[PDB]
Amino acid sequence: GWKYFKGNFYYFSLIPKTWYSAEQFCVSRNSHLTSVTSESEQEFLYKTAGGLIYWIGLTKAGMEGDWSWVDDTPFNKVQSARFWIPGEPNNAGNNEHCGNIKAPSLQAWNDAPCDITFLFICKRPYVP
């Protein structure tokens, strides 16, 4: 069920999991929760998400609680500022240290508690 898009395969899960359990699942399938590095990729993901909520690879790292990608793609605060839902990230309840795709828009991302279960998206490079 992996969907191909610009050099990567993507798995849109059918079963919801917490952020970390989702990441463990992706890792067991030789992948990671997806990073998002372009407008075209953001568009691919939110459109494929079809209005439902999916964990992606967004999580806090380091002392300052800066956002990061679990697949180790460097997180670009400038280029990503446009990808959040207006008002996000808001660290609502001071317990929102992971990120998902929530809205079908370029402004798609919400930070939510890592322990909430949602569907999730894995990303795996195509290597020939």
Ligand X SMILES: CC(=O)N[C@H]1[C@H](O[C@H]2[C@@H](O)[C@@H](CO)O[C@@H](O[C@H]3[C@H](O)[C@@H](O)[C@H](O)O[C@@H]3CO)[C@@H]2O)O[C@H](CO)[C@@H](O)[C@@H]1O
Q: Site residues (CB under 6 A) for ligand X?
A: 88, 90, 92, 96, 110-113, 116
**Which among ligand X, Ca ion, none contacts residue 24 (Cβ within 5 to 8 A by kind)?**
none
Smallest gap from Cβ 97 to Ca ion, in A, equals 10
Contact with Ca ion (CB under 5 A) among 15, 47, 72, 92: 92
Q: Which two tokens stand for residue 11?
A: 């798995």
- Residue 79 as a binder of Ca ion (CB under 5 A): the answer is no
Cα dihedral 60, 17, 108, 49 sign = positive
Specify the residue, 52 or 116, whose C-beta has the smaller distance to ligand X: 116
Instruction: State how far the alpha carbon of 81 is from the alpha carbons of 3, 64, 85, in Å.
Output: 27, 17, 10
Positions in the binding site for Ca ion (CB under 5 A): 88, 90, 92, 96, 110-111
